[PDB]
């Protein structure tokens, strides 16, 4: 049942660089999915 | 007049320029873009041809304008990957000076520049847009137009969170790019982060059938893996925050496996673990089961994923889905799948136990095939470790005797 996450924590992931200089979308996916994990 | 608006030359210089001057300087930027990417070469006969220096838009019919609009929109999608380069700015400059695309195409122009909203060029674009033509969904940019400073990324996020028409506008542009194979990494990452933060916002505040069709179309762009994966992010967050019911969780899973490819296979898999983890129903559909067992060494793949996520409900739903298929068509091909999944140690005790009990009644339910299911029942009851303990306790509780089967299978 759901996950409690702070909007600041999801916002760190997409503020490390401008869109053009971000890690591959695969690495960003893993970060985000790990932040919303059930354990 | 309006001739002084320019991305490159300051108003005092730009007002005096002839179209020949502008053309010969901007044309050099376009031919440098051609040397980098042949897809620009078609436009050498239309938007950037010699004839174009004289073309007066106001003398075109309503179709001719609409055809010009389409060529311009197409070019904008193509040039979007190179707006950090001066030759790209020079090519856009030509379209602005000669076809006034900052008047007739200002929505496409703005969306093209939006992933670059932190570079000086973006503030320079803002400084020449005719405000009267900026679409409603971009008027949150008004304070940055007056102060001539870059909009922080949290302004874009917060407007897209609160006003779906910007979100819908970023998405539409991104997807038209993908469909036209004019996408580029920065566009995929930008739409991904805006869509993630926004949808996380949209739900966080309310404690969504407008972005449904967008996620679903992205999940099946086999030629654009980045868009597929980026939509896996959003679909992850959605499900991971109690935000969806069981029937729509299933349709996302169904759409995921229906469009995934080898390049998206691992992120798609961890997304499937999250989707099923928040289903209240236990048994996954047939379509997902049939597609998930095509992962080479599925068991070791979920065990790798288990060091960050919980895999037990994907695992459980698979076994029941295959047990159910054996109960209903007596297909011995399910027995290797059930067996390797049960023994995987990814289920939990009571999951295994109802898995096994359900397997027993599935055997009972069909009227050789009794030989292999019986033998599979027996092999499982002798398994060395925890799963075997559960399978045995489960056999005690059901008042089933393996032994007469053990012996009847012998004879």
Numbering used by the authors:
A (entry chain B): 917 to 955
B (entry chain A): 27 to 233, 248 to 407, 415 to 458
Paper lines:
The 5' region of pre-rRNA that consists of the 5' external transcribed spacer (5' ETS), 18S rRNA and the internal transcribed spacer 1 (ITS1) is co-transcriptionally packed into a terminal ball of ~40 nm in size. Within 90S, the pre-rRNA is cleaved at sites A0 and A1 in the 5' ETS and site A2 in the ITS1, yielding a 20S pre-rRNA intermediate. The fully assembled 90S contains an unprocessed pre-18S rRNA, U3 snoRNA, approximately 51 assembly factors and 18 r-proteins with a molecular mass of 5.0 megadaltons.
The N domain of Utp10 contacts with the WD domain of Utp4. The box C'/D side of U3 snoRNP (Nop1, Snu13 and the NTD of Nop58) fits into a U-shaped trench formed by Utp4 and Utp10.
